[PDB]
Design a protein around this ligand. Structure first.
Ligand SMILES: C[n+]1cn([C@@H]2O[C@H](COP(=O)(O)OP(=O)(O)OP(=O)(O)O)[C@@H](O)[C@H]2O)c2cc(N)[nH]c(=O)c21
Lengths: 14, 181
């Protein structure tokens, strides 16, 4: 089950 | 890992709705794009309008690939929606922030086991007041629907004074709340 943290996903935006 | 995209649990499809009264509701629903990685999500999001900027009468929907963003779909017809109603001040302060948070809750599978109960989410841009909703698959799954509302509310950072309702699509298509959080 692939879960991602909000903070991880935000860090990827650029 | 220096070169592999970050895979998502699901492939997601982003849909756009623009009202055209000469067409059936369904026909106004256009697939923008599908993605299944974090990198591919941001690529799409970064190039499309903020909801706060859409003409009134437009929607975005983000749904699991294979689930059409409409009541009629098998995965939707026994389902319902957690609904956030925004006033006109919130278009400025909260709409795009809430919509992105909702996107991140979906693609990140933020509701533990019950993320499988999630169908997708929709943002309605309306002159009378904008709405954001998360659609779940079965309005009878009390624990699923209820865990989703709870975590979602936390994620949006809504204060205890605000109460959001869950409405079944059966009722909406014929609206009372089956649950609130
Ligand atoms: C989510 N939805 C909306 N609609 C049509 O769109 C009408 C407007 O619904 P909607 O965009 O969700 O919300 P609105 O703020 O525009 O209008 P409202 O006064 O009905 O709350 C609704 O009454 C239906 O005729 C639909 C028609 C369908 N056949 N299947 C849908 O899933 C569906």
């Amino acid at each position: 089950r692939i879960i991602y943290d909000r903070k991880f996903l935000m860090e990827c935006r650029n | 890992e220096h070169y592999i995209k970050h895979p998502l649990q699901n492939r997601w499809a982003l849909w756009f709705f623009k009202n055209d009264k000469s067409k059936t509701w369904q026909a106004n629903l256009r697939l923008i794009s599908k993605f299944d990685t974090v990198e591919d999500f941001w690529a799409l999001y970064n190039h499309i309008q903020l909801s706060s900027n859409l003409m009134p009468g437009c929607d975005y929907s983000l749904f699991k690939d294979g689930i059409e963003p409409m009541w009629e779909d098998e995965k939707n017809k026994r389902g319902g929606r957690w609904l956030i109603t925004l006033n006109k001040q919130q278009r400025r302060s909260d709409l795009d922030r809430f919509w992105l948070e909702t996107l991140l809750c979906l693609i990140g599978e933020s509701f533990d086991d019950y993320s499988d109960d999630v169908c997708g989410a929709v943002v309605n841009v309306r002159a009378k007041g904008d709405k954001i909703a998360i659609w779940t698959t079965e309005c009878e799954n009390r624990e699923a629907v209820t865990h989703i509302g709870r975590v979602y509310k936390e994620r949006l950072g809504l204060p205890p004074k605000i109460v959001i309702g869950y409405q079944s699509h059966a009722d909406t298509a014929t609206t009372k709340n089956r649950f609130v959080v």
